[PDB]
Ligand binder design. Structure first.
Ligand SMILES: *C/C=C1/C(=C/c2[nH]c(/C=C3[NH+]=C(/C=C4\NC(=O)C(C=C)=C4C)C(C)=C\3CCC(=O)O)c(CCC(=O)O)c2C)NC(=O)[C@H]1C
Length: 304
């Protein structure tokens, strides 16, 4: 069972109890975007990240209490129609706004809407994946294609063994970087609660491995007096234990995509950049689609 989070009197995480970190409810986000939560009926703004002013151009005490009908009068009616009560937490409403461009992503958890604001601004990929004659070739073409699309310094295909140890089975990397190909890593480097979360939510990232997390205020959802679930928010703050691991490897930006085969976490497409780096929201949607394509192709090939 999970420890309480830091804001409910829980301990700082050490290597003795990695697996008990409640990574899904950090109560904070990464600073390259802004997050609001709102009531799914009234559109009343219930929580905001403390940096929301410098993104949305209003005072911090002024935003709390207002409704989305006032703030987003064009989007509010379509948002309600798109995410009605009872819909699953995987469904996403997406829009592009002009601002004094911002990408808006919304999902629903229970009676709460979660709004993510970020600045914004493939045919041949599909047939490259289908053409591969064996599993190795598919792995190599997948990492090389993802690197061409994104510009990341390193793209790995990271495969889980039955005992949850991992191995880099294919790799595309920048000239001068040393190889991780064939190296194996202990199960605890990606602990059990992360592996479970990564089976339901297929993409996550750390844009800057040195940036401090920005709190949500208030930290608890006023509907429930309980933590806000952020498992489905890409702006979710990353575990400080993983951030340190990345800094010690010399990585400034990290992103991975889940490869899910037969409902099981088969591997990750895992990406590194040496400097901080924000991938555009449109291009993340493409990566997500490639992960599903790769999952189907990996399934049929493992028969042979
Ligand atoms: C005691 C805590 C430990 C710990 C926790 C932890 N790790 C993650 C997430 C990831 N770890 C990854 C491991 C690797 N990346 C690599 O490049 C290599 C080697 C080539 C390894 C072994 C990966 C890929 C992830 C996923 C995220 C990403 O793509 O960057 C988490 C979950 C983080 C989050 O989602 O908030 C946690 C809690 N890792 C340890 O090593 C010990 C100290």
């Amino acid at each position: 069972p999970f420890f309480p989070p830091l804001y409910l009197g829980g301990p700082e995480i050490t290597t003795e109890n990695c697996e008990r970190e409640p990574i899904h409810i950090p109560g904070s986000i990464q600073p390259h975007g802004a997050l609001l939560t709102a009531d799914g009926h009234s559109g009343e703004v219930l929580q905001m990240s403390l940096n929301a002013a410098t993104f949305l151009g209003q005072e911090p005490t002024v935003l709390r209490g207002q409704t989305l009908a006032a703030l987003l009068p064009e989007q509010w009616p379509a948002l309600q129609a798109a995410l009605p009560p009872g819909c699953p937490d995987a469904l996403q409403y997406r829009a592009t706004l002009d601002w004094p461009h911002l990408s808006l992503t919304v999902h629903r958890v229970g009676e709460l809407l979660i709004l993510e604001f970020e600045p914004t601004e493939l045919r041949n990929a599909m047939f490259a994946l289908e053409s591969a004659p064996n599993l190795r070739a598919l792995a190599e073409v997948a990492t090389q294609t993802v690197r061409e699309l994104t510009g990341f310094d390193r793209v790995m295909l990271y495969k889980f063994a039955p005992d949850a140890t991992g191995e880099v089975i294919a790799e595309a990397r920048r000239e001068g970087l040393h190889a991780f190909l064939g190296h194996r890593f202990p199960a605890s480097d990606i602990p059990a609660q992360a592996r479970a979360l990564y089976t339901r939510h297929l993409l996550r990232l750390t844009a800057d491995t040195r940036a401090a997390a920005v709190p949500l205020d208030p930290v608890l959802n006023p509907q429930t007096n309980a933590p806000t679930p952020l498992g489905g928010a890409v702006l979710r703050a990353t575990s400080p234990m993983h951030m340190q691991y990345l800094r010690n490897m010399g990585v400034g930006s990290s992103l991975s995509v889940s490869v899910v085969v037969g409902g099981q976490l088969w591997g990750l497409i895992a990406c590194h950049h040496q400097t901080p780096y924000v991938l555009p929201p449109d291009l993340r949607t493409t990566l997500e689609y490639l992960g599903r394509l790769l999952s189907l192709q990996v399934q049929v090939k493992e028969a042979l």
